[PDB]
């Protein structure tokens, strides 16, 4: 299963010019496009080789869409500040995430189109792609505005038609990076806490996609209460890293096992110091 997801960020900055609009687009965990309204000559920019060889008409159209979206978000930020009776001096953020999930059959599983204001849910398109859920009164104003405009019909058209077509085209053109799984290379490290304790750290390096599970077991039972788990992090090369760590008594290291689960692994993976 695969997804194409766009992430838009608009940020006001009173007294310091017009709001800045930023967009990034992803297929699964791989970014392919960026736009920044504050750049010298703002244009849609490739971030992946499988869209770099799209023609000039493609890139000109993306660029024009982002430019229009930035303008639209400027008006949205102003309207929202009014709905909430917020003061002129504050900086505010409007975020939009939209896209399409493809099921294992290659068919549309879920389209989504949802918004946040100041980091908090504002309005979202329901899974039926026909109706809206507003999170507060202010958002009810947008809901009636969009219901009157038949906005949802336009978003549905994109989500069921155009969104899937793009994603299927990218999956094919970028199959060498998009349709692959790099399994994690795994190792345990050992760090004396003292003379009586030591940290055991289980590492997963260089995997793709980002989804993974690391778990620490002792003689069989999971070590939920005592596991320190960092968030999965980008290596910088298109792969990801994660670690899981436990503090164990000195001399009892051998009783602990680290369990790694990932799409790319050929078999169950067990590690032990």
């Amino acid at each position: 299963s695969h997804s194409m997801r766009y992430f838009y960020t608009a940020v006001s900055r009173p007294g310091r010019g017009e709001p800045r609009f930023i967009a990034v687009g992803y297929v699964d965990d791989t970014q392919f496009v960026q736009f920044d309204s504050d750049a010298a000559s703002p244009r849609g920019e490739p971030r992946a080789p499988w869209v770099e060889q799209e023609g000039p008409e493609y890139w000109d159209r993306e660029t024009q869409k982002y430019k229009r979206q930035a303008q639209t978000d400027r008006v949205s930020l102003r309207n929202l500040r009014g709905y909430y009776n917020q003061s002129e001096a504050g900086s505010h953020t409007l975020q939009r995430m939209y896209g399409c999930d493809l099921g294992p059959d290659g068919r549309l599983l879920r389209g989504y189109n949802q918004f946040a204001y100041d980091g908090k849910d504002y309005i979202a398109l329901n899974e039926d792609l026909r109706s809206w859920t507003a999170a507060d009164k202010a958002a009810q104003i947008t809901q009636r505005k969009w219901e009157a405009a038949r906005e949802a019909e336009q978003r549905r058209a994109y989500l069921e038609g155009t969104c899937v077509e793009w994603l299927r085209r990218y999956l094919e053109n970028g199959k060498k990076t998009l349709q692959r799984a790099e399994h994690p290379k795994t190792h345990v490290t050992h760090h004396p806490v003292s003379d009586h304790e030591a940290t055991l750290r289980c590492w997963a390096l260089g995997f793709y996609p980002a989804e993974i599970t690391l778990t620490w077991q002792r003689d069989g039972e999971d070590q939920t209460q005592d596991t320190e788990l960092v968030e999965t992090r980008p290596a910088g090369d298109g792969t990801f890293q994660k670690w899981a760590a436990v503090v164990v008594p000195s001399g009892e290291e051998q009783r602990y096992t680290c369990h790694v689960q990932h799409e790319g692994l050929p078999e169950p993976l067990t590690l032990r110091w």
Binding site: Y6, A23, G25, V33, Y58, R61, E62, K65, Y66, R68, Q69, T72, V75, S76, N79, L80, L94, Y98, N113, F115, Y122, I123, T142, K145, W146, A149, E151, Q154, R155, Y158, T162, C163, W166
Partner: peptide
Amino acid sequence: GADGVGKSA
């Protein structure tokens, strides 16, 4: 390919 633009909030 991004969505085309609709109405302001």
